[PDB]
């Protein structure tokens, strides 16, 4: 970790917040949480703080965008991350499984 110590602590709180949003919004995503936790650069979270902002209540819209499946965003995290190459795959399953529930409920 490079930077002020207080910054690191602040960044950690951001990660926890993001984790709760992902689990609560649609479904529990352990892999997603691991990615944020694996972040070794605190400054990265702050810079991407606006990116992790919560969008409209319409989760369907957010799912379509799938920011986590962005090659550009993911590129920056290429230097440091965990399961990043497998992140897009796991996420696809989430949208895939989420819609499955809808079909089941008629």
């Amino acid at each position: 970790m490079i930077g002020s110590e207080k910054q690191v602590n602040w960044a950690k709180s951001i990660i926890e917040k993001e984790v709760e949003a992902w689990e609560a919004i649609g479904v529990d995503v352990r892999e997603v949480a691991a990615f944020l936790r694996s972040i070794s650069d605190a400054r990265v979270i702050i810079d991407n703080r606006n990116l992790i902002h919560f969008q409209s209540s319409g989760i369907s819209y957010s799912l379509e965008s799938s920011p986590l499946n962005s090659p550009i965003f993911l590129r920056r995290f290429s230097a440091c991350s965990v399961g990043f190459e497998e992140i897009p795959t796991a996420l696809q399953r989430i949208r895939s499984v989420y819609t499955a529930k809808l079909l089941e409920d008629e």
Side-chain angles (χ1 to χ4, degrees):
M1 303 125 289
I2 300 170
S4 178
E5 180 63 20
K6 69 181 184 298
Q7 290 179 41
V8 171
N9 183 355
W10 183 24
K12 291 292 183 180
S13 64
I14 291 169
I15 291 169
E16 290 301 311
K17 179 64 176 180
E18 290 180 49
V19 171
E20 290 301 311
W22 279 105
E23 293 177 352
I25 187 167
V27 299
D28 185 353
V29 281
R30 293 293 185 182
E31 290 88 352
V32 171
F35 174 76
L36 291 172
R37 291 177 62 81
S38 65
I39 303 300
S40 68
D41 288 347
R43 67 182 181 181
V44 170
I45 293 300
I46 293 299
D47 186 352
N48 290 340
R49 180 180 179 183
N50 55 54
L51 290 171
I52 58 170
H53 192 279
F54 180 78
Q55 302 302 118
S56 297
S57 294
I59 60 174
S60 180
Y61 176 78
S62 293
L63 290 170
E64 182 178 0
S65 180
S66 198
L68 279 52
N69 289 345
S70 301
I72 289 98
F73 182 81
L74 278 32
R75 181 178 179 180
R76 289 185 291 174
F77 288 88
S78 180
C80 70
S81 54
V82 67
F84 59 92
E85 72 185 1
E86 301 296 338
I87 266 169
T89 299
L91 290 170
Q92 194 279 331
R93 182 174 293 176
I94 297 293
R95 60 175 294 176
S96 292
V97 94
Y98 180 80
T99 60
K101 290 180 180 180
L102 179 61
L103 291 171
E104 290 173 348
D105 183 358
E106 52 154 324

